[PDB]
UniProtKB/TrEMBL annotation, chain A:
<protein>
    <submittedName>
        <fullName>Major capsid protein</fullName>
    </submittedName>
</protein>
TrEMBL record, chain B:
<protein>
    <submittedName>
        <fullName>Major capsid protein</fullName>
    </submittedName>
</protein>
Automatic annotation (TrEMBL), chain D:
<protein>
    <submittedName>
        <fullName>Capsid triplex subunit 1</fullName>
    </submittedName>
</protein>
TrEMBL record, chain I:
<protein>
    <submittedName>
        <fullName>Major capsid protein</fullName>
    </submittedName>
</protein>
Amino acid sequence: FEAIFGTFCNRLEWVYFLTSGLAAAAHAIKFHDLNKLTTGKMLFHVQVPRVASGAGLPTSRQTTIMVTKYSEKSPITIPFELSAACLTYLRETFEGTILDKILNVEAMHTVLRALKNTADAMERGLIHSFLQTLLRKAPPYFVVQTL
Amino acid sequence: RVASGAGLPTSRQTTIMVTKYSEKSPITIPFELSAACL
Amino acid sequence: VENATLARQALNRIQRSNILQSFKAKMLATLFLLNRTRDRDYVLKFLTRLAEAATDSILDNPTTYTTSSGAKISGVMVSTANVMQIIMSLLSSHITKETVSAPATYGNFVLSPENAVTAISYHSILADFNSYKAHLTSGQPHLPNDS
Amino acid sequence: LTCVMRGYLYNTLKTEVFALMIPKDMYLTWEETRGRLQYVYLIIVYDYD
Amino acid sequence: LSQAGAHSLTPLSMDVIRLGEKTVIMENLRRVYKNTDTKDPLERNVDLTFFFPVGLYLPEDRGYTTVESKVKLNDTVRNALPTTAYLLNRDRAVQKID
Amino acid sequence: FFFPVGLYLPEDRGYTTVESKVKLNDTVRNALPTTAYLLNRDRAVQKID
Amino acid sequence: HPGFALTAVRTDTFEVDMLLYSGKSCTSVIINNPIVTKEERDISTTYHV
Amino acid sequence: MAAMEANIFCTFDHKLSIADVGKLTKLVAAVVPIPQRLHLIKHYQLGLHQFVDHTRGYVRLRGLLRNMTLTLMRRVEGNQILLHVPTHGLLYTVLNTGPVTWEKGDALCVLPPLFHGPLARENLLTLGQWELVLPWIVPMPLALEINQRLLIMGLFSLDRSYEEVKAAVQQLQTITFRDATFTIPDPVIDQHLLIDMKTACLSMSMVANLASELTMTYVRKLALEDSSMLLVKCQELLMRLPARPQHVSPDDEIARLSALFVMLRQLDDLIREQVVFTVCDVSPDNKSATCIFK
Amino acid sequence: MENWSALELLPKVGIPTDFLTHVKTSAGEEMFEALRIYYGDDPERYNIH
Amino acid sequence: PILSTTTLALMETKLKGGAGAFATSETHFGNYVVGEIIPLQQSMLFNS
Amino acid sequence: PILSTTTLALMETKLKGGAGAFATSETHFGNYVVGEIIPLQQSMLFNS
Amino acid sequence: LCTGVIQKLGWCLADDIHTSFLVHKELKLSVVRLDNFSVELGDFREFV
């Protein structure tokens, strides 16, 4: 004999953004017209809490404060591909035999598996790009502990 | 895969097939009986 | 286990050099570690690193080796008598004498008739042939279980 | 024989692609590393000996 | 922004820790980079810059010693003039730089 | 296991860390390395020459 | 020995597991639907998202 | 590995104002080069500001631009630029960049921009001290006489005083092709220019050797009897010094003419860069055209 | 030399995988034998003889 | 600063010495030890 | 590396000394002790 | 004339280029092999 016991495919873990706890630091909004904007600015207006003081001593003043922040840009990309034989066996059945049905269901399953792997890669890349954009503005511990 | 950012060449789809084989190791014990019982 | 994250392709010269460095460190550190030191915490840390270091099997029967009150068995450590009783005496706060389930008999596994026909014809065995044939004709590309 | 003028080299039904073979002595590269795309040419150089 | 979206909620399990009435979610990201290609960005290569001298000359008008009970060198002008330094490798092993 | 016998130290880099613990006679039969001493299976000295 | 005290400088890189902490909703990320982009060739048709 | 991406998305990581995107909306159907091809590229490699040297070698920029990959601009939006790498022999619209009037039928070349810098005063996407330097698209005879005057400047650079070169550049920089003046920036010496001069002198020596007596004497044989203005204008650049030919042969001289055509081709390829656009119909405001052969 | 068409075509039982190291390291350093590491999608599984 | 001694003798007391001996810095007449300001030759290759 | 020495007196001050002496390695003017890197003599005699 | 000649044959993927061998009547002949390749012909240009 040769005793082919078992053929084993892989089941990938379907990790999403909101399933991970890293989305606790995130505020995930979906906005369909995102590519039509340049940048998102945010404005803040603070006047300071002053304090009275004793005479023979200079005092404070009302100082307006306006601060402004901006958004960021980080596109991502996954290039999955399909052979032309897969597209040929997906649409075009012929001769009605058993093996033609096997090739058709194999074409359907490789397209489905490529789509699922592409979606999983998109989720992992979203987590990765969020982590990159998070780490690119975090100061080290000694800076904030000094401050 | 992981979705890479701009200006970075990313990996394409990749499938890996491996094979594991069995190991045979037989065992044997000899033992003898006389003809006085027979 | 301390370099699984970092290497993701064929190894570099620096990577294999760090592997050799960790070999020459831990081989000198961990020979006769029971004969060297006999504290509870380091031995427990070494044993839990040894337990984490192995990978789990591809096949696992979940209902066998069930510890009473519903616990499950990860692994088994075998040794000689003196080393085992030294482990017993050194860590008494972690040993529990418990009755677990066990598979009562062997795994009776037999070939199908079509397995025998393929075995005499093409000198090979594909186990659970009927499940392969039925899932192939149906189109479901994932089996429930293997042989 | 069936040759091609333009396009890829493939079996019928496009089940598998066909490769181009060249012997080692006719093979010639002029750079230590290659780009993403590279053209393949033909060179007949004349030794006027 | 908070008015925009985040309508429904679902429960899911994770692990937290309590530090001065502040509960914070502990997380690791091995499952997102298990059999992937890109490097995990929490694994990082930091780099320090070391420096050491070799071949100096301490002044002899104020020369002294503090290990005269611990060490003893013979009367040698080569001993009393530093030209080599001794350092360690990434392994604990004596290296020489002349 | 491996060990040197008869290995010669330099004199220009001569030093001694252990002088309160031990002191030897000035004869070079003790000040030139020509023999060595190891330990047996039991903790006992032995001489290799 | 010449009249020279060369002072050596060098660097050493270390493979280091860091850790990161951020507060809840420290930044808001807006996204959109994925954009399927086709690309056709004779031997295969790749895609882009 | 992955194949060749027909569509290339570029992303401006730096923050754009509305005026820059408004200027970029006028840049549709324009040609831009890229050094490498990826599906999602950064904005530094796009353009030509990555290759502006302090040498400012126009032959160096020309040879570098010849090895880039040409693309067309499309679908300008927020921090994203579609680039279509065009395929062979298909129809494509195009928008002109340099101040050259275009006609129909004349093939076009791609060229580095003349008078590059702040002197041309181009407000093309200036951000992070990086400009968007657009390669010019010129017709055939403009690029031909540009390469010709560069090679003539190179051949005149040898064994001449510096003020002789300064008296030559005021003659050779003025090109008035199609009623629009143009100037040659910084004609200097370069090792690539040395390579062009070496192959030019070798090809000139070879065609001087392979020239038969009838080719050498046809100008005198025509100037003894015929008379025209063009004959006079081509005779005055020649030097001073019915007979039967000594020896002629058809089969030898056709081989001589084939090898001579080969040597003139090996001289011609220096000034003729490449055809990259073949115009069918321009827009009547001379701001756009259609083309083939990409 | 194993029938990889028989692996890709036949229905396969799914598992939660656990390689100790990264799987491409295990392929590039031969923990196993006959490692089919084709990239993209090779359509050679389609034609059946 | 990194552990670097000029003589092999003053190196040897750093190996007979106990933990934290690398942080010190002793000098002989024409010899000296500069010690490491952080025990990374004492601990980071010694986690075992 | 195994425990080796040059003189009987230096082996005497090694063996007479306390536990952990065999990990150290001292040197006299012309005599020397190399010490075994693991305490195998210590462990193998101490479990006895 | 035409000391060398040159023409375009095609373009490859620049990653499938590898060494294989041809066999004809049990005779090995080692080859460079280009898997995903498309032909693109052109006339004989020349250079001297």
